[model samples]
Target: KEVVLLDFAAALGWLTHPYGKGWDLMQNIMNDMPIYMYSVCNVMSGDQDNWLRTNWVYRGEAERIFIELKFTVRDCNSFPGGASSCKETFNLYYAESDLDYGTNFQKRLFTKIDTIAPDHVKLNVEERSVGPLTRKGFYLAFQDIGACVALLSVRVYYKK
Candidate 1:
């Protein structure tokens, strides 16, 4: 059986943007939370990427665990140099430490070569239980090659 322990969609209804509206606007989508909304220019380097970390306190034994991310990026019009020069990569990471950045985690890569811009992307990964996952918490990190990445929602699931 599969159980969803966390869902970010429910929190979206309570979000408010007190400042001006635009894609370029820097705003925290969730008040007092780590979730954020960024313009294409704001999410430049990997350092600016947002990391969502959580502590899991499960009572029942689970056979597997996974996380799903739904997101989109807009205004990718400028592939000015070439395919090699384009910023078309998205990175995801899983880690045991809350302080771990993109560097110190298991990495996953997603790339888009299609002509579509501002497309929605969904990615999911499940834990491979070579042994028991005894960690108390896990961290999820996201980085876009360029700016303008919006995370719509996230879900974490476990199998019993």
Candidate 2:
């Protein structure tokens, strides 16, 4: 069992850049609604050096946004190392927004990694739309995760 670390910086960079089909659409959608937060997580095997990443997008009709996300790793199988024998964990959170640029757009919630296993990993992303009469949204890209031979990926997109 192994835990794969994702290039968080690279993922964030894509959100900033407007290229290709998805990026192009994302940029346009963001123009009409604030980008609350963008988060990515990867899970990998000990023998492998990559991870399967998952993405989640949450939107609302508010000027401000708040997000809270985390990553957790646990054991769940019978192995020579026991349940907690082969263990590894890594998690990070960021609170950002367009407020500094004189925009009410803010990010209070981001992404969270819940658990990782040899078979798969689980993660979630959430954004709370703040302010009155505003809209917020987000997008995700598997990117390099697939290049490293990811076996499975779970993603969900929603708006309110």
Instruction: Please provide TM-scores, in order, for all candidate models, with all chains considered together.
Output: 0.48, 0.23
Q: Give all candidate RMSDs, comma-separated.
A: 9.0, 13.6
**Number of the top TM-score candidate:** 1
lDDT of 1 by residue, 1-160 (tens): 6787657654322211221232232455566666544333343333333232333324234335565656565433543343332343454544443232333323233221122233323232323221133454444444434445555666667776
Q: Rate the local accuracy (lDDT) of all candidates.
A: 0.41, 0.28
Instruction: Please provide, for model 2 over 48-70, each residue's C-alpha lDDT reduced to its tens digit, 9 standing for 90 to 100.
Output: 12222223233333333332233
* Model 1 clashing residue pairs (backbone): 40-148
| Model 1 lDDT, residue 34, Cα | 60
The segments of candidate 1 whose C-alpha lies over 4 angstroms from its true place after superposition are: 12-60, 78-86, 97-132
